[PDB]
């Protein structure tokens, strides 16, 4: 029953890995500065992901064994937003602008799915028992590993070329997201009702992640001049 | 409606407490420059556009045949347009400053504006499994707090608008009037609540006002930390 949930996540990962946005980001015949055109889009997400971890996943009030594991893991995942801001500046995307241009960017209709991903995960998660929150987190982190494996390609290109330490679109981020881990609790037996719910979770997490990546792809096409401007 | 009657009475009681908060004492104090009273204005950024999104994507359900949801949808069309008024007045007040992208992000996601940022998030979570009649209690409670907030803010706003001969749209009487408001949701006091609905509605009104008071506390503390600073309207 868990076996099947864990296999559905690997199926969803395999279709997710194939999305056009990822073939573009991986395409070494395109400059990495051009492939990281979508980097600013992450603003509408990276900081919501911090809040999801601090406020929605974490429950310091709880005494349940599984929620304590979750509480521990959310502790680390809530720190990566500063890495996003680090690489924003390294990539020359930390541009001076009117406050209103920053707000109109975050709340753009073209970044609706990006901005609402974490909100959707919080709504999905708020009435789940902790083992079912661990399915949300495990599926989400699978979509996450796919996204950051791809972005760390042009990221590490720029990092080595410019000799600056990238922290977000970087192997160190992909490595510490992976490196008791939650998947290790594939020694859990799902009731019939939990299996039906775990199907809803894994499907929604991958559909919402697909919608975000579609928005990233549309942004690149709408902004093909606005390549990253790193400095040696 | 004696159950419904209690709910409407609880909202008035919460409004009476809410109107008396220190933030609104400050905002209403004509012995202080309206420029210093609106120094909290930029804090609304973390709320105004989230409110638009709550109306567009959470409150609204275009496909519903439900009598109550069709009335909600009509009200959401209008109330989701006010964020442009927010950005209009942001510029007029001199608060649409040049800054790095990251300075804007760190502001919006400030730990000092957590309750401001998450008010609409909390309403969407509260609203997720509500039948349309109960979504109306959420909207009426919320709007009761909004009308208190904007009635207060419109006082220094209209002061600046008159003196600078500029049209303010957000911290302005026009906003309060159009927001107050075919049928108004409160006119749906021709509805009776089951005992269980009545319990849920009490929970709704208590949380809406708790979350609204949390936002106002953050504004009050922001003001305290920015008293030397003020709005810079141009004539
Ligand atoms: N690893 C991301 C979070 C994330 C998880 C899953 C999917 C996408 C993003 C971060 O630090 O911001
Ligand atoms: N009237 C506010 C929204 C709001 C509603 C309810 C309470 C508080 C604020 C706006 O236009 O942004
Ligand atoms: Fe991360
Ligand atoms: Fe409004
Ligand atoms: Ni972990
Ligand atoms: Ni719920
Ligand atoms: Ni653009
Ligand atoms: Ni209305
Ligand atoms: Ni300040």
DSSP A10: H
Separation in Å, CA B219 to CA B51, B93, B229? 17, 17, 14
Structure tokens at A219: 């942004």
Report the residue numbers after which chain B has a gap, meaning the C atom sits over 2.5 angstroms from the next written residue's N, or none: 181
Domain containing residue B15: CATH number? 1.20.910.10
Do residues B14 and B205 lie in contact, with contact meaning Cβ atoms separated by under 8 Å?
A: yes
Evaluate whether residue A227 is within a structural domain. Answer: no
Do residues A183 and A138 lie in contact, with contact meaning Cβ atoms separated by under 8 Å?
A: yes
Among B87, B101, B121, beta carbon nearest to A100 = B87
In degrees and rounded to multiples of 5, residue B192 shows phi and psi of -100, 140
CA of residue A165 relative to chain centroid, distance: 20
Among A81, A94, A123, beta carbon nearest to B100 = A94
Evaluate whether residue A152 is within a structural domain. Answer: yes
Residue B226 CB neighbours (<10 A): 14
Overall domain count for chain B: 1
Documented resolution in Å = 1.9
Evaluate whether residue B49 is within a structural domain. Answer: yes
Residue A126 CB neighbours (<10 A): 12
Do residues A99 and B95 lie in contact, with contact meaning Cβ atoms separated by under 8 Å?
A: yes
The contact set of B with A (CB < 8 A) is 42, 45, 49, 52-53, 57, 83, 87, 90-91, 95-102, 104-109, 114, 117-118, 121, 124-125, 128
DSSP A97: E
Evaluate whether residue A8 is within a structural domain. Answer: yes
Evaluate whether residue B165 is within a structural domain. Answer: yes
Structure tokens at A160: 């080595």
Per DSSP, the residues of B65-114 read --HHHHHHHHHHHHHTTTHHHHHHHHHHTT---EEEHHHHHHHHT-GGGH
Q: How many CA atoms lie within 13 A of B129 on its CB side?
A: 6
Do residues B86 and A104 lie in contact, with contact meaning Cβ atoms separated by under 8 Å?
A: no
Evaluate whether residue B187 is within a structural domain. Answer: yes
Report the residue numbers after which chain A has a gap, meaning the C atom sits over 2.5 angstroms from the next written residue's N, or none: 179
The contact set of A with B (CB < 8 A) is 40, 43, 47, 50-51, 55, 81, 85, 88-89, 93-100, 102-107, 112, 115-116, 119, 122-123, 126
Residues from chain A contacting residue B109 (CB–CB below 8 Å): 47, 50-51, 81
Q: Classify A98 as helix, strand or coil.
A: strand
How far is residue B18's CA from residue B11's CA, in Å, rounded to a whole number?
10
Q: Is A54 left (phi over 0), alpha (psi -120 to 50) or beta?
A: alpha
Experimental method: X-ray
Q: Which strand (E) or helix (H) includes residue A96?
A: strand A96-98
Evaluate whether residue B230 is within a structural domain. Answer: no
Ligand 2 lined by B145 (C-beta under 6 Å): yes
Provide the domain limits for residue A87. Answer: 2-222
Evaluate whether residue B233 is within a structural domain. Answer: no
Q: CA of A89: which chain B residue's CA is closest? A: B102
Q: Is A92 left (phi over 0), alpha (psi -120 to 50) or beta?
A: left
How far is residue B229's CA from residue B36's CA, in Å, rounded to a whole number?
7
Atom of ligand 1 nearest to the CA of A140: 6
Measure in Å the smallest separation between the Cα of A97 and chain B Cα atoms.
5
- The residue among A186, A203, A192, A77 whose CA lies nearest residue A136 is A203
């Amino acid at each position: 029953g868990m076996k099947a949930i864990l296999q559905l996540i690997l199926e969803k990962r395999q279709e997710f890995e194939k999305l056009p946005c990822f073939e573009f980001v991986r395409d070494e015949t395109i400059s990495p500065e051009e492939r990281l055109i979508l980097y600013p889009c992450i603003a509408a997400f990276a900081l919501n992901f911090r809040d999801l971890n601090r406020y929605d996943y974490r429950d310091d009030n709880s005494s349940d064994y599984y929620q304590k594991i979750i509480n521990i893991h959310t502790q680390e995942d809530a720190k990566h937003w500063e890495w996003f801001l680090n690489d924003l500046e390294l990539l020359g995307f930390d541009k001076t602008m009117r406050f209103s241009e920053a707000l109109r960017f975050v709340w753009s209709d073209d970044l609706l799915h990006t901005r609402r991903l974490c909100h959707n995960i919080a709504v999905l998660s708020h009435d789940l028992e902790p083992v079912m929150k661990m399915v949300v987190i495990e599926a989400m982190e699978t979509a996450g590993l796919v996204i950051f494996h791809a972005l760390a390609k042009p990221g590490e290109s720029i990092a080595k070329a410019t000799r600056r330490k990238y922290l977000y679109v970087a192997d160190s981020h992909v490595e510490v997201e992976t490196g008791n881990i939650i998947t290790i609790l594939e020694q859990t037996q799902l009731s019939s009702e939990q299996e039906e719910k775990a199907k809803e979770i894994v499907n929604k997490v991958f559909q919402w992640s697909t919608n975000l990546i579609g928005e990233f792809e549309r942004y690149v096409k709408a902004h093909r001049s606005e390549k990253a401007q790193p400095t040696a």
